[PDB]
């Protein structure tokens, strides 16, 4: 699948993407992968740049309103419920939401982990990294989504 | 009684305490009685300093929350009622409250009078004094309390 392959590529190249930094709503005009210079990018723009490398384009800045009506996704689990036993049933590439108001999102990877940027709010210098799901399981919020390209347009 | 003796001593020494001035929330660290220099003290801190001279200590700054739960007092008359005939039944040393939100308090003395500091709000220079109860009877609010030391601790 496209999403799984992209997630595996990101995991393989995760250590080499230290140039990408964390910011609240970073929306740079330069592709992080096509430049060695450091650049501040958030999770939504990171996903947009990751999916723009292939033929898919999506849209910019790809805020929370993108998922509501664009039809690019179909929900797997709804918000409001939180089960720790069903986490194993998920697959790589699924988008994981965080925060009570959709403050941040993430990409699921195997072995009970997820890829996202975490740090202090006022433009932290910490680069992208991978964190265990146990400590962040509290703020998972239960929302899960998945991609689909074959039927769209 | 301790409270009655303290009130009588304050009344006797009332003329000699002109050094003490009035302020909204004066909480000086220096005892007014142990210094000739003028100092700004409000009614609550005045009562605290008066009762600190003896073995009793109480607490600081002795705000309105002190009376709620410390157990140092038992109510004589509740708020919300205002009878002018029952005023004679009071005794010296009883604490008299003023204001709709417990803005100020006072100490009752015989002959239908009370001891308190009155003046304009922004740090009036007027010293402590004694005023007739007739004009201030309107803002009495009906709340009356009394002291008790024998049973406490």
């Amino acid at each position: 699948p496209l999403s799984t392959i992209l997630a595996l590529d990101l995991n393989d190249n995760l250590k080499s993407l230290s140039n990408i930094k964390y910011m609240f709503k970073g929306a740079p005009k330069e592709n992080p992968f096509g430049t060695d210079k450091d650049v501040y990018i958030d999770t939504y723009n990171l996903l947009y740049w990751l999916y723009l490398g292939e033929d898919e384009e999506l849209a910019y800045p790809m805020n929370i309103n993108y998922f509501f009506t664009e039809g690019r996704f179909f929900t797997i689990f709804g918000k409001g419920h939180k089960y720790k036993v069903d986490v194993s049933k998920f697959i790589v590439g699924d988008i994981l939401f965080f925060g009570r108001s959709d403050t941040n999102i993430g990409i699921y990877v195997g072995d009970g982990e997820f890829i996202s940027m975490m740090g202090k709010f006022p433009k932290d210098e910490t680069p992208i990294g991978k964190y265990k799901l146990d400590d962040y399981w509290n703020e998972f919020n239960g929302r899960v989504m998945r991609f689909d390209e074959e039927v769209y347009i | 009684p301790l409270s009655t003796i303290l009130a009588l001593d304050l009344n006797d020494n009332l003329k000699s305490l002109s050094n003490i001035k009035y302020m909204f929330k004066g909480a000086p660290k220096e005892n007014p009685f142990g210094t000739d220099k003028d100092v700004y003290i409000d009614t609550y801190n005045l009562l605290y300093w008066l009762y600190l001279g003896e073995d009793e200590e109480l607490a600081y700054p002795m705000n309105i929350n002190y009376f709620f739960t410390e157990g140092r007092f038992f109510t004589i008359f509740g708020k919300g009622h205002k009878y002018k005939v029952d005023v004679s039944k009071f005794i010296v040393g009883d604490i008299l409250f003023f204001g709709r939100s417990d803005t100020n308090i006072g100490i009752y003395v015989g002959d239908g009078e009370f001891i308190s500091m009155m003046g304009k709000f922004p740090k009036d220079e007027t010293p402590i004094g004694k005023y007739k109860l007739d004009d201030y009877w309107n803002e009495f609010n009906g709340r009356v309390m009394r002291f008790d030391e024998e049973v406490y601790i």
Binding site: - | K25, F68, G99, S101, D102, T103
Partner: protein, 261 residues
């Protein structure tokens, strides 16, 4: 006689029929479960539960009163979602005095609960008295958060937020300390409205300081040009104040900032 052996009830002879099945009047019940998605509850009788049919939340449930609800000419729906609480006592009125069809009329609290959530010390008196009007006329309400809102017939009006932060206003010189800013300002404990009825302080639920902001923006105006002017009055938890005016398209900004130090 032989034919008299039929359904009957009461000391005086009465023919028991379908009329007795119909419930005459109103009954009370307690809220046991609430369907949050539809905001329709199921109430428990002392030994029975109304509603709770096979339908989860939507097809069958007990409605609840609403302050107001309707639809605009454009078509968009508007209304209110008043707070619902478990364990509260609610009055119920059956449709056509037919059982198995409840509707909640209103919610009534216990005497102890009512006594706890009022600050009026007067035991009684006619409302027309001027002195009683000071205390009787008080639209005292508490949000689901322990921070409350207060209004009164007099000029006093107090509002509270997270932590000990509050907003207040008054006009009388006697009530001047309630909304003063001398030295460090009035303490939250000094206000009499910040105490429950039974001589207990109204603790805020959240003690962490809030951060306020007044963001202003639009789309267009009568001139026809697009609206691109953004201004804010952000306040941080650490005490900073920032008043700014922005024009995002032209990439210009002017900010008046205050630091915590």
């Amino acid at each position: 006689m032989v034919v008299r052996f039929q359904s009957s009830m009461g000391r005086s002879l009465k023919r028991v029929d379908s009329d007795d099945l119909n419930v005459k009047g109103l009954v009370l019940a307690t809220v046991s479960k609430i369907n949050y998605k539809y905001q329709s509850v199921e109430v428990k009788v002392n030994n029975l539960t109304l509603g709770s049919r096979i339908g989860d939340d939507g097809s069958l449930a007990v409605p609840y009163p609403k302050s107001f609800i309707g639809r605009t000419p454009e078509g968009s729906v508007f209304g209110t979602k008043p707070l619902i609480t478990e364990g509260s006592v609610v009055l119920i009125g059956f449709l056509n005095d037919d059982i198995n069809s409840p509707i909640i009329l209103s919610v009534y609290g216990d005497n102890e609960q009512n006594k706890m959530i009022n600050t009026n010390p007067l035991d009684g008196g006619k409302f027309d008295t001027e002195s009683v009007y000071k205390y009787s006329s008080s639209l005292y309400e508490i949000l689901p958060s322990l921070n409350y809102k207060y209004d009164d017939g007099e000029g006093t009006s107090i509002r509270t937020y997270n932590g000990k932060s509050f907003f207040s206003m008054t006009s009388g010189e006697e009530e001047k300390p309630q909304a003063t800013d001398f030295y460090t300002g009035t303490e939250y404990q000094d206000l009499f409205t910040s105490y429950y009825g039974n001589k207990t302080l109204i603790e805020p639920r959240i003690q962490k300081a809030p951060n306020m902001l007044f963001k202003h923006q639009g789309v267009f105006y009568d001139d026809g040009t697009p609206d691109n002017h953004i201004t804010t009055l952000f306040i941080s938890e650490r005490g900073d104040i920032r008043a700014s005016v922005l024009n995002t398209e032209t990439q210009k900004r002017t900010t008046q900032e205050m630091s915590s130090d």
